[PDB]
Each structure stands twice: as structure tokens, then as C-alpha cells.
């Protein structure tokens, strides 16, 4: 059982949270607003922290100290970046995965050792088939 911390319980966010919880992992879902947790499915044993991921007092509340994986998965790159940097350099989380929208930004994450999931990078694969 991994201790997964998912930041941002959104469209893409909560999907990670549900696949994680159903796989018997201990999940912590952090989100800017509570109504986002509606996306968290019925069968979900994890805990949820409401709070701004840019605030430090929120990052402490997640217990990233005991985390195996931190997913920075909000709709903001800089936020996701900040989340990751705290995870990597402030809580020394071994695995930190960030959702990065702007493909140009991907580099500065990996230059800090933050694995990245970029939708645009993922799409270029599928858009290649359409020719």
C-alpha cells in the first residue's frame, strides 16, 4: 500500500484519486474547494484536505512526510510546480508527479526531478495518427 497524495480533485485529478483508492492505496486528496470532492466516488476510504495548495499550512496538513507519491494535479502549472517543489525539497517525497499544461514548462520540472504528465505531449501522439 502506497501513501498517495493527490493535489486537486478535478476532472483529471479525482480520476487519479479513484483509481488509487480502488487499488487499495491510502489516498489524501487536497483541494482549493470542497465541492470538488463530489467527484470522489462512493468506495473511497481516503482523507480529504480542503485548502490552498500554495499555502504552506496546507502542505503540512497533507502529511507529505509519510507520502510515497505526491501528484501535483491542479489546473495551474505554477501551483503544480510549487506543490512539487515542496514535495521534493521540503518533504523529500521520492516520487513527485506533476500535471503540466504548457509543454515549454515541462523542462524546468524535470530539471528539479519532477516527473510530468503533459496533455499536449500526450496529444501529439494521437494527432499523429490523423494523417
Amino acid at each position: 500500500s502506497k501513501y498517495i497524495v493527490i493535489f486537486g480533485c478535478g476532472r483529471l485529478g479525482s480520476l487519479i484519486a479513484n483509481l488509487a483508492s480502488s487499488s487499495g492505496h491510502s489516498v489524501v486528496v487536497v483541494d482549493k474547494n470542497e465541492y470538488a470532492f463530489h467527484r470522489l466516488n462512493s468506495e473511497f476510504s481516503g482523507f480529504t484536505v480542503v485548502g490552498d495548495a500554495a499555502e504552506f499550512e496546507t502542505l503540512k496538513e497533507c502529511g507529505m512526510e509519510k507520502a510515497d507519491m505526491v501528484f501535483a494535479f491542479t489546473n495551474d502549472d505554477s501551483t503544480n510546480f510549487f506543490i512539487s517543489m515542496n514535495a521534493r525539497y521540503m518533504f523529500n517525497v521520492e516520487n513527485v508527479i506533476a500535471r503540466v499544461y504548457d509543454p515549454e514548462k515541462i523542462k524546468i520540472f524535470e530539471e528539479n526531478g519532477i516527473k510530468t504528465i503533459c496533455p499536449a505531449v500526450l496529444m501529439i501522439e494521437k494527432v499523429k495518427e490523423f494523417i
Binding site: 500554495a54 499555502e55 504552506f56 521540503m90
Partner: protein
């Protein structure tokens, strides 16, 4: 070397005005088209309208290895990014950033961005000094692990009528400067603390509790 001020409405103005007056070169990089035009007209600097977090905009500003980038945005998540972007991708050694959340000061230090003293901390120290004037209130924090506090000598206080030599202060504490009625008094041994006087103190955190217990 130019001072790249990366956005921050009004404070960004007065910094730019300050830097220019200090005969420096200033690049203002702001995302507010309206404020950019106001700056352009008032300040004699280079105003680049655009998002400081965009590599392209920073390229347009021509941020050089030796430039000093000052990030003044209200969003720490952005600041830390704009910082790393300037530091890693542009090789800027000297970065100064505003850090809004006092909690976030640490990670900024850890990353090697130099930070301005946190506003809300100063405000809190100033406000708490006004509410409780007769208790050792912290000024501006020095090096990590050494605070710079200050206390006012109360008439009914034990410290009044005591020699500075005779005062038993802990090893890692220094009664730096006495200020008697808006006049600096260099604390010699035979110096005696009088009523209505203001003693500034530098003490290490691991000795602050005892320093206050003795002085107050």
C-alpha cells in the same frame, strides 16, 4: 547588469523609481497592459508587457546571467517558478523575491532565492508591539537562528537602576544599543539602564527565553 523588476503594480513602480535614482538600469516586466502604459510614461525604464513566467517574455526582456531579477508578484507559486525559470534557464545568480506566506519563506531560502523580509511578519511584529509595548518585541530577523528584538524600560521594571555589566545576560545574547530619548547610547560596562529608555537586543533563539526573563 540591469535590475529586472518582474511585476507587482504599485510597489513595482516605487522600486523602479528607486533603482533608476540609484543610477541602475531597469526592466519592468508586467502583465497589466494598462499599468505598463502608465509606467512607460512615468518611469524612464524598459517596460515589457507580458507574463514573466513565459520564457519568451524573459527572452524579450533579455534577462542576462548577471542581471538581478526581482520578483514581486502576490502569488508565491508564481514567484518560485519565475525564480527557478530565471535561475535555471537563464542562469540568473541574483534573484530577489517577495514571499507572501511567511510559511513559504523556508522553501524560497532552501531553493536559494534571496527574499525580502516578509511584510506580514513585519506588520505582525509592529502591530503586536503596539498592543503590548512593555514586552520584548522582535524587530527584523537577522541570520537563520538569531532574532533582533527590542524592549522598553518600564519605570517599575527590575532592569531600571542596574549596571549593564551587573546585568546577568546569557552567553549568546548582546545588548546591542540603548536609545535614551531618541539618542544612541553605546553600552559600556558602567552604563546604567534608565526609565523611558529603549534597549535593542540581539539574541540567538536557543537563548531568547532566558534573555527576556532576565531583561524584563
Amino acid at each position: 547588469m540591469k535590475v529586472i523588476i518582474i511585476g507587482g503594480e504599485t510597489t513595482a513602480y516605487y522600486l523602479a523609481r528607486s533603482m533608476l535614482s540609484r543610477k541602475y538600469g531597469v526592466v519592468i516586466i508586467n502583465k497589466d497592459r494598462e499599468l505598463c502604459e502608465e509606467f512607460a510614461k512615468k518611469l524612464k525604464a524598459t517596460i515589457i508587457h507580458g507574463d514573466g513566467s513565459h520564457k519568451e517574455i524573459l527572452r524579450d526582456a533579455e534577462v542576462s546571467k548577471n542581471d538581478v531579477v526581482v520578483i514581486l508578484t502576490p502569488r508565491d507559486e508564481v514567484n518560485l517558478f519565475i525564480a527557478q525559470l530565471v535561475m535555471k534557464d537563464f542562469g540568473v545568480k541574483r534573484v530577489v523575491s517577495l514571499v507572501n506566506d511567511p510559511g513559504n519563506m523556508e522553501i524560497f531560502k532552501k531553493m536559494g532565492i534571496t527574499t525580502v523580509l516578509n511584510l506580514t511578519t513585519l506588520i505582525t511584529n509592529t502591530v503586536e508591539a503596539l498592543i503590548f509595548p512593555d514586552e520584548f518585541s522582535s524587530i527584523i530577523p537577522l541570520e537563520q537562528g538569531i532574532e533582533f528584538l527590542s524592549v522598553n524600560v518600564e519605570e517599575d521594571s527590575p532592569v531600571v537602576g542596574k549596571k549593564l555589566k551587573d546585568l546577568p545576560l546569557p552567553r549568546d545574547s548582546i545588548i546591542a544599543a540603548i536609545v535614551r530619548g531618541g539618542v544612541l547610547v553605546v553600552p559600556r560596562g558602567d552604563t546604567e539602564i534608565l526609565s523611558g529608555d529603549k534597549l535593542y537586543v540581539i539574541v540567538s533563539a536557543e537563548a531568547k527565553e532566558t534573555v527576556e526573563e532576565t531583561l524584563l
